[PDB]
Amino acid sequence: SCAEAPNMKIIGRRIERIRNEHAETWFLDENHPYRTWAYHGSYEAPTQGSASSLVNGVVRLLSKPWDVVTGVTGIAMTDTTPYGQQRVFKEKVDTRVPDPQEGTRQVMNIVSSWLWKELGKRKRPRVCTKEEFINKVRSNAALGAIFEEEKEWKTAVEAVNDPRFWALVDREREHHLRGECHSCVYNMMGKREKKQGEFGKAKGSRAIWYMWLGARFLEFEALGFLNEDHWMGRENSGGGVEGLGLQRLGYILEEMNRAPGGKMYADDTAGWDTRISKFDLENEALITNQMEEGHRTLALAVIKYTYQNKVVKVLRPAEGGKTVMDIISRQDQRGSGQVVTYALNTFTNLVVQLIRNMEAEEVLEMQDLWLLRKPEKVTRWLQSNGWDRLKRMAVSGDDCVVKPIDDRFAHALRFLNDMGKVRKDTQEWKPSTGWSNWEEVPFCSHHFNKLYLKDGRSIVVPCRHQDELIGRARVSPGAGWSIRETACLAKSYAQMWQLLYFHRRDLRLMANAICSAVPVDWVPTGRTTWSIHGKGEWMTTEDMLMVWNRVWIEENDHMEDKTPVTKWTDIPYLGKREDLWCGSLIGHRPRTTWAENIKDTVNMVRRIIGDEEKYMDYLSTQVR
Ligand SMILES: [Zn+2]
Ligand SMILES: [Zn+2]
């Protein structure tokens, strides 16, 4: 019910450009629903999104028992219509978290500037080049063109090979260096998901926003070194884990459990991106004091004009079926699709958890909440304990797992709530619940189990509820996708299961069915997960038994005995209790029928794709 006071001198340039590039249809809506955001104007626009997602036909026909399981059919029920997005905005994005008291702002100031120093000892900030951007971007990124001069392209790889795209970039950078910002504007779309189960992970209603491709280069140019040089990697950050895949996250949770201390706390912040305060964006900007003078100017141009002052375009339903685009402003919060969204969240989250250990270890008191009593004590505790507490953390974005020195961590909440990083689904002052067994700790939408191998070895495999994995695969990201295109996406989900969730009985059988129903020569396409830890080693025509040995045996630094595994039958499953607990259907009437007649179902899918294609029998590589 307060703010914004829009800094019109910084954002007003882009406002009048969007206004005057639509000056015939620009108007001011008196009935706009934006309470905590700064409204600027509206103009007519076509509709976008869909009330429901299309279902992958190949995966659906090969997963009949789950047509009645609400846990998997609900994942395809995402809503992206302008009405569905506005329902998310008024609930999760149109908020205002009160300012932390002055004493709390001091701790964040001290700890943040301390971590940037530790993070930049073995590393050196630098500018990122044009060729680094051309090699990193995939053929189909988000073009995100919003202006007239920016809609000259159709694909992302097409733009980067055109000297015209790098001409618009040079002008905006020259606009930045002169003190203005002319074209860095966010596109915002929303997803309202019909959800969920009790403790189902990963997917909730959220807002997705990103800038256009040229703006994200200037973003990647000034601060892209955080991702390219692996500043949030575990080797350099201690508590980070950037770069490690789902085949390695389990070992860290096990590594932490052996160290002495209390329980393992994996509390989850509700709406982490929205809970970012204007003081945290200042503390994240402390990295600017380590850059060369040419770099420092480019960085502040991105920070002041893209991070600390944002302009967003949002759709909204109007009268008579027509829709309309809104222009709004916001000074705090984090855009979900900023180039360094993951790195800046991992940093801030490390600072938050570092502070929470202080409140538990009786370093900070309620005195310090409203005014720092003795600020000389904060820097002392960080140098004799700060790095020891980072190495007992695992932070990936807004996901964190902390191993405190004792169980006073569960009650250290006053500094946490004042910083706005409130916990999800808990009373404001109820102590946090901890985990005694690391194999139950949630982290990155997964728990991690220890799989004992046939020859006396062991890997730590990732695991999650089975309905979330089948439901995701049954989703086709767009209409008009061909039969071949949907089959290649089905092959990607199947071969991903063969690499990470092979220990699940239903997933290995369904994967062998999909691989037996999709032609053997066809190259898998698509994106099976948007998580940073899904490195995508399954996107290949290579024999999945070969790639299994590479990520679990050959290149596993936790596996000293590197003797290869020859058969798929030599790799066990989880215990039937653990498999059933995570959503398996072993023993049920319809699942047993589906397993018996899976060859008949695979043969029918083969006829949809074509009798002419060459197929392989991956079901005969499994007898049990
Ligand atoms: Zn700009
Ligand atoms: Zn499990």
Numbering used by the authors: 268 to 891
Provide the publication's sentences verbatim.
To examine whether the interaction of the MT with the RdRp will affect RNA synthesis, we compared the RNA synthesis activity of NS5 to that of a truncated protein, Δ264, which lacks the MT. To better understand the difference in RNA synthesis by NS5 and the RdRp, we determined the crystal structure of Δ264 at 3.0 Å resolution. The asymmetric unit contains eight RdRps that exist in two conformations (referred to as conformation 1 and 2) that vary in the locations of motif G, Loop 21 (residues 312–323) and Loop 51 (residues 742–750) that connect the thumb and fingers subdomains. The two conformations are affected by residue Arg483 that lies in the template channel. In conformation 1, the side chain of Arg483 inserts between motifs B and F and interacts with the carbonyl backbone of Gly604 and Trp476. In conformation 2, the locations of motifs B and F prevents the insertion of the side chain of Arg483. Instead, Arg483 interacts with Ala409 of motif G. NS5 that had the two aspartates in motif C replaced with alanines was unable to direct RNA synthesis either by de novo initiation or by elongation from a primed template. Δ264 synthesized approximately half of the de novo-initiated RNA product as did full-length NS5. However, with the template that directs elongative RNA synthesis, Δ264 synthesized sevenfold less product than did NS5. The RdRp alone was also competent for RNA synthesis, but was less active for RNA synthesis in vitro.
Nonstructural protein 5 (NS5) is essential for the replication of the flaviviral RNA genome. The N-terminal portion of NS5 contains a methyltransferase (MT), followed by a short linker that connects to the RNA-dependent RNA polymerase (RdRp). The MT adds the 5′ RNA cap structure to facilitate translation of the polyprotein and to decrease elicitation of the host innate immune response. The RdRp initiates RNA synthesis by a de novo mechanism wherein a single-nucleotide triphosphate serves as a primer for nucleotide polymerization.
